[PDB]
Amino acid sequence: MVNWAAVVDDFYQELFKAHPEYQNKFGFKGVALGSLKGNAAYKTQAGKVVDYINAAIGGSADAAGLASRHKGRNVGSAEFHNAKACLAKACSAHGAPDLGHAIDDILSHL
Ligand code: HEM
């Protein structure tokens, strides 16, 4: 199977390197990037993201519901366009299929 856990780890490295302030919205605010993998909040959140990717591939993802929850954290289409780029870099680093269509599905509700 594609190692989505590793893809997501590289995704958050790319995301928070480019936009460190986005990290302040999570339970691992303030934690050094090189130690995220040892942080309990981060392990939980990454696992949710992996689950969402597997749901999107599997055909069960609720993009509208995810979008609504992100608006509920004052996260919008600008942030998602940045994430789309970071995720494309992470997928490429692992030879994983690009997830741009899944992110577009979320964007269509933002
Ligand atoms: C590839 C783009 C992204 C995907 C696939 C994604 C996915 C997810 C998922 C699956 C959850 C958990 C939702 C739930 O439990 O129902 C979540 C929560 C969250 N996301 Fe994202 N996300 C993305 C981008 C972003 C960006 C750019 C931000 C900017 C800060 C962000 C901020 C948050 C926050 C603050 C939470 C709540 C975390 C908490 O409960 O402590 N997300 N996201």
Swiss-Prot record:
Keywords: Heme, Iron, Metal-binding, Oxygen transport, Transport. GO terms for molecular function: heme binding; metal ion binding; oxygen binding; oxygen carrier activity. Residues 2-110 form the Globin domain. Heme binds at H70. SUPFAM superfamilies: Globin-like. It holds the Pfam family Globin. The keyword Coiled coil does not apply. InterPro entries: Globin (IPR000971), Globin-like_sf (IPR009050), Globin/Proto (IPR012292), Mb-like_M (IPR044399). Belongs to the globin family. Homotetramer. Self-associates in the deoxy state. Seems to dissociate upon oxygenation. Acts as an oxygen store capable of sustaining neuronal activity in an anoxic environment for 5 to 30 minutes. This is Neural hemoglobin.
